[PDB]
Nucleic acid binder design. Sequence first.
DNA 1: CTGACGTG
DNA 2: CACGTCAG
DNA 3: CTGACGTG
DNA 4: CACGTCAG
Lengths: 296, 296
Amino acid sequence: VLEQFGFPLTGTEARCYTNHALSYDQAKRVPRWVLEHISKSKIMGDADRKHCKFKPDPNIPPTFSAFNEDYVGSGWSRGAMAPAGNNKFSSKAMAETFYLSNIVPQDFDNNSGYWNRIEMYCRELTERFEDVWVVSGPLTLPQTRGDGKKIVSYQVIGEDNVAVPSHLYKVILARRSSVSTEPLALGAFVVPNEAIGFQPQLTEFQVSLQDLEKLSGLVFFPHLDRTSDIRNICSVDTCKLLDFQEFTLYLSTRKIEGARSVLRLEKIMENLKNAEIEPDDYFMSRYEKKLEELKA
Amino acid sequence: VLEQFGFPLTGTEARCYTNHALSYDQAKRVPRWVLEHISKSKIMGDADRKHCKFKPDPNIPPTFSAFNEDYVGSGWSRGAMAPAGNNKFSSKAMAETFYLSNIVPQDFDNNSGYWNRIEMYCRELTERFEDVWVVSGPLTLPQTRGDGKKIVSYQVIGEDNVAVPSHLYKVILARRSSVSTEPLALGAFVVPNEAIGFQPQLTEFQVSLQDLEKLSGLVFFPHLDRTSDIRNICSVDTCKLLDFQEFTLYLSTRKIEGARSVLRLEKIMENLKNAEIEPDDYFMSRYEKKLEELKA
DNA sequence: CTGACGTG
DNA sequence: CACGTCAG
DNA sequence: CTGACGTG
DNA sequence: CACGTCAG
Ligand SMILES: [Mg+2]
Ligand SMILES: [Mg+2]
């Protein structure tokens, strides 16, 4: 009798795509969590975000979907939780990361800077671990005022009132190999949704997993054996993001992956040379292999 | 192998009790929705809330539970979504309504005044409809600031950061009889979590079901056929709360039975007459009986 | 790599 | 809106 | 009815 | 804390 006309629906079921899964927040119009698994093969290939378009997820009821009109002109950028750069292997997978079900309102500088560098480090880990799992998502955390009152405040944007998070979180779980007798590596990080420089190290944003679960109301990787050997990812690995020089270099390399015209190449080396940087052996070895191909 | 260690858990599964069900919000430490079914029989009985105590729900993971320490001294009252008064028929059901999984931080005046009167009206509906279903819960809505920005802002209380809602909602669905071909009657209401006098009629807080679903991120009564004719409950019924005199007389009537001394009983009568409220014959019967017993 | 912005 | 251009 | 508080 | 007392 109680359930004669059904229980209310919260819409939090896991939604699976080609190379990520998420749970959606219908009230805030953003994901609660986005889970991915990266390996060196996934991050290679010819998929190109220039052929992709942000758009509502066709599997989300339109009443609870965000739309591009919510974001454009808002002063907030569209920030993908599963990044396009993790899906070079499949045009379909990359396009599915442009569904707004994967997007939160993100500070432009953060999206293009510190958070970008965290994503780059997650990819770097596949050079050292066979398997890497990442859960990313938004948070709206309280601030404590001087009188002890704790208050959650956040902006909502657009006709659809899309929630702008105060912070973003990432949980990284890395397994060296399938046969490894070695412990798993785990780290949880919470970063404010704002411009962050190159000075603060990633460890300054590290939190215990239990604290993140309390803050987010989520349980991550719930099948994990609690007596298994898990260590702090920042003690068995570096947790070292790219510095300015290496970040500018990396970006330039990503740009030599692409080739459109000569004068473009000119502008590239122009801005790069205004900041010195001696091309290290890697960017050179990757410079000739492409230069030859292009003049061919 | 993306799900190697399981998907993250959000904890929103429906939880069923003797005479209500709820979905719990582990981040805010309050229910998202509480569903109940009321009839003539369930609101009769000897269940007494003086035998009950607010306590954590033993089925909620302690990590995500509220505790009484979060509420005591906070300035906010414990506000039940499924009310004790709907569970006079069963001491077990009543006890379960005092689990903190059914509780939100509620303005004291609102809890004991306007919201109390809405609850009373839900019970009144069982005099004219055989079956009444009600979904109740908290809401944290934005305000539009002077500069046009829309901001959500709410307090979180206690060491567990229990979220204080800005508003409370109720959806009421009423069915005349199980075999009747009369359309069902439905209403949705959104009330601010603050003191509300006797002046505003309940219809001033009515909203369309669609608007409440968009604001709450929920779909209510998903098995209700919305394409068949459904009546506005404030059209087919009264949506009239008890007015000051009726409310005060009802409260005084219930206070008669609790009075422990002649002083307190007599002061109940004095307050009534001081406000120019006339007692009714039933009230004077109970009052004279109790007064005789306490004097003796 | 991460995106928005201005012209059609 | 598309799409080239620009920017961190 | 709805609740918070003060004492063995 | 459990209980009795008090207030909206
Ligand atoms: Mg991004
Ligand atoms: Mg109440």
